[PDB]
């Protein structure tokens, strides 16, 4: 994903905290898991366009939604490249 595409998502993840902080428990719990008709709807759908569902995440370093490894902050190329120069601890060619 290109410089711009990353950017899009940075601002999405930023705005996530302005629809998910105090707003978070509000958006979810206090608004779901029973409570619940034409009310619940228009409340919960506050923009439609920010929620953690809508977070596409990607890397913090080079983006792209394929290849991704959320658990470790790393992605396809950003394993091989880095690891080789020894920029990720612990990694070595596999032999389990």
């Amino acid at each position: 994903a290109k410089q711009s595409m990353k950017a899009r998502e940075v601002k999405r993840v930023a705005l996530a905290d302005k629809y998910f902080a105090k707003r978070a428990e509000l958006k979810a719990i206090i608004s779901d898991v029973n409570a619940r008709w034409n009310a619940v709807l228009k409340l919960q759908t506050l923009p439609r366009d920010s929620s953690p569902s809508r977070q596409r995440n990607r890397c913090r370093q080079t983006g792209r939604p394929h290849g991704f490894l959320r658990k470790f902050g790393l992605s396809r190329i950003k394993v091989r490249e880095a690891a080789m120069r020894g920029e990720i601890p612990g990694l070595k060619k596999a032999s389990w």
């Binding site: 658990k71 470790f72 020894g86 990720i88 601890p89 070595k92 060619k93």
Partner: protein, 206 residues
Amino acid sequence: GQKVHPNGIRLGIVKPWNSTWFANTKEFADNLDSDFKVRQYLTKELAKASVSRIVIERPAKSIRVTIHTARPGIVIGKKGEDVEKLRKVVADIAGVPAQINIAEVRKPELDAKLVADSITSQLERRVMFRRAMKRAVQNAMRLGAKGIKVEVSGRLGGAEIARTEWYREGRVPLHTLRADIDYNTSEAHTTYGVIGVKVWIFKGEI
């Protein structure tokens, strides 16, 4: 790819990684990204001296700025004012404080990264090409080494078609696992493209 260009299995057997820190399994990611970002800003503010290689050490409550150079004559600057400032930058990206560590000497003929960025500066001033890598390998054999083998991409005279710049002298085995293969990369930023640079010194046996 020719070979798999190995040097990360060779920090997996001998000599710790160049970014040793510990984190929890999903706490990894944060600690990760912050580090590679910090390393980048670090290498730019640290191109004033010849980078042998930065490495970092983080016990997750401080980070350690552990640049090694062939120009600690610049890294000091005047007293401790120099590096002081540089630490502040660190503090921004990776949110913890930092402490400066020593830069040791061993001659820029030794350790592969010295011999990289040097020949690269030459090439970006558009001189020697064939003779560029060569002068820096007669250097490295002069004192020390048990054989150096540089490889550098083609494009002699600045020319369009590449034809590989390859000279070795001595011995560099490149599959040894009692090994002492130093390796770093540079890339030039010529007015015609990108010349990848590769330096392989077999300093010793272990």
